[PDB]
């Protein structure tokens, strides 16, 4: 049970990582940037999260 809970908790915590992007919050990037560079930031986040 502890191993499964630790794996799930680590997976959740990984969403707060930047992975090189300006912000770990996808909505913040969408609100701050126009698509031409928001897409680069989202690509970094997508790579990290995948």
């Amino acid at each position: 049970v502890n191993q499964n809970a630790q794996a799930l908790n680590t997976l959740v915590k990984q969403l707060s990582s930047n992975f090189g992007a300006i912000s770990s919050v996808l909505n913040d990037i969408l609100s701050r940037l126009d698509p031409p560079e928001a897409e680069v930031q989202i690509d970094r986040l997508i790579t990290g999260r995948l």
């Binding site: 909505n27 969408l30 609100s31 701050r32």
Partner: protein, 49 residues
Amino acid sequence: YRVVVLSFELLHAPATVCGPKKSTNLVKNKCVNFNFNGLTGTGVLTESN
């Protein structure tokens, strides 16, 4: 050449300078797109203790 550099601070602090938007009403307990002090999001809202 006259130059103005406008540095904007986005921190987890109250927004003392905001845009020319229009605050709307409150819809509680219903799935809604929300914008609280610049924090944009999508979700449902409840009264909290």
